[PDB]
Design a protein around this ligand. Structure first.
Ligand code: CSF
Ligand SMILES: OC[C@H]1O[C@@H](O[C@H]2[C@H](O)[C@@H](O)[C@@H](O)O[C@@H]2CO)[C@H](O)[C@@H](O)[C@H]1O
Length: 379
């Protein structure tokens, strides 16, 4: 009997947590590990310290069939310790279930550890506000059973389906907001169902690591001394945070880039609606997938210091390097930001906007008139 740990995430936030789990378990050099983290490359000089370390691409939110070749190397009874993105859990586990079916006598699922993609889970949950949540859970459990028995995916409620894994496996959920499950009264049956199977994402985990593990972790997430030194400047700091679009449409991507540059100007120019003051040093923390939208800010802004877009914002909180003020388009990063540091959060374009509702529920935004980015004069 042998445990194999899989770390799967096409996004950022679950991978960030999973790399913490790997760091905590980094003394064990031989434990079989499969990394399917789209946004993170484990440095070679770390890879070389480990045996039984494997890598798999994700395509369409699941491990490719390359997974099967890796698993074939382990010919005995194997138990899978699987780490997943919640929003994408059903697809990510699909090839794992298919492999289990082919080797039903030797392959088992030990447990699941699941982490929020980010704001998406909460925006999705907000849309379920008028449903009988208790009934949705019971139906999702039944349809999960069919998935597990047949390999066929069919959920009447794809959103609630993300939360019923306990009906089949030992599970632990790691939520960006545990407050949401307390504050959204319509979700009470889900809170109660999830019982003792969840905790909040622990942003104090880094602080409890040894100095050696802290250095190891920072190497995994792409943090380095130069970014550290850039943020240790003796001046008040403002970080402008970027967003992205998943649309490939040039019109849409150019629109996003232009509108986001205009937003930055509203923060940093004296005439801007959101003017922060002349004494701040300005940084840009682009979205990890901003791509040319990121480039547009760096090319068209002035006196801005880039924080490499691949560095997740929450690392600055872990390292105690948060700036005085943070502003930009609504992002998952605002879910764990101390409220005193929020300048303004801007929504893309509506009181009943589900993202607005989520943040209002959570006390991240107040009762004032929300700001959409197309409400801003082109400066
Ligand atoms: C509602 C919805 O669809 N939410 C998804 C969200 O759950 C997740 F898929 C992600 O989350 P998103 O809120 O962008 O932020 C996710 C994480 O990326 C890092 N980050 C982000 C922005 C930034 N300027 N600096 C950073 O470092 C932080 O670690 C943060 O916690 C994502 O791509 O991972 O993208 C959004 C949207 O699809 C996207 O914003 C397009 O508008
Ligand atoms: O990168 C992780 C995020 O992916 C989003 O899906 C995008 C995808 O990134 C993009 O390449 C293309 O395939 O369009 C998808 C949207 O339909 C997820 O929606 C988001 O939750 C993150 O997981």
């Amino acid at each position: 009997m042998k445990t194999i740990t899989l770390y799967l995430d096409p996004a950022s936030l679950p991978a960030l947590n999973q790399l913490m789990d790997f760091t905590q378990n980094n003394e064990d050099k031989t434990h079989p590990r499969i990394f399917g983290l789209s946004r993170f490359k484990i440095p070679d000089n770390i890879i070389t310290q480990y045996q039984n370390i494997h890598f798999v691409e994700l395509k369409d939110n699941r491990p490719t069939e390359a997974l099967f070749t890796i698993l074939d190397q382990y010919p005995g009874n194997i138990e899978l310790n699987i780490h997943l993105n919640i929003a994408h859990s059903v697809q990510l586990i699909r090839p794992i279930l298919a492999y289990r079916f082919k080797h039903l006598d030797r392959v088992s699922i030990q447990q699941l550890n699941l982490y929020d993609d980010g704001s998406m889970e909460y925006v999705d949950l907000e849309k379920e506000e008028n449903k009988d949540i208790s009934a949705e859970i019971k139906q999702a459990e039944k349809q999960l059973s069919h998935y597990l028995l047949t390999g066929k995916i069919k959920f009447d409620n794809p959103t609630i389906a993300r939360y019923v894994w306990q009906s089949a496996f030992p599970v632990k959920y790691h939520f960006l907001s545990t407050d949401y499950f307390e504050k959204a009264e319509f979700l009470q049956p889900l809170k109660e169902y999830l019982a003792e199977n969840y905790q909040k994402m622990d942003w104090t985990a880094y602080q409890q690591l040894t100095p050696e593990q802290q250095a190891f972790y920072l190497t995994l997430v792409g943090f380095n001394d130069e970014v550290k030194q850039s943020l240790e400047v003796q001046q008040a700091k403002f970080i402008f945070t970027g967003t992205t679009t998943w649309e490939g449409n040039t019109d849409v991507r150019e629109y996003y880039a232009q509108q986001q540059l205009n937003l930055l100007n509203h923060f940093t120019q004296a005439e801007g609606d959101l003017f922060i003051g002349d004494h701040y040093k300005i940084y840009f923390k682009g979205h990890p997938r901003g791509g040319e939208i990121n480039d547009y800010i760096l090319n068209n802004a002035k006196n801005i210091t880039n924080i490499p877009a691949n560095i997740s914002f929450e690392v600055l909180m872990m390292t105690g390097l948060l700036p005085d003020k943070v502003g930009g388009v609504a992002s998952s990063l605002y879910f764990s930001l101390p409220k005193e540091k929020i300048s303004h959060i801007i929504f893309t374009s509506a009181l009943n906007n589900p993202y607005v509702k989520v943040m209002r529920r959570l006390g991240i935004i107040d009762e004032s008139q929300v700001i959409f980015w197309d409400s801003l004069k082109q400066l």
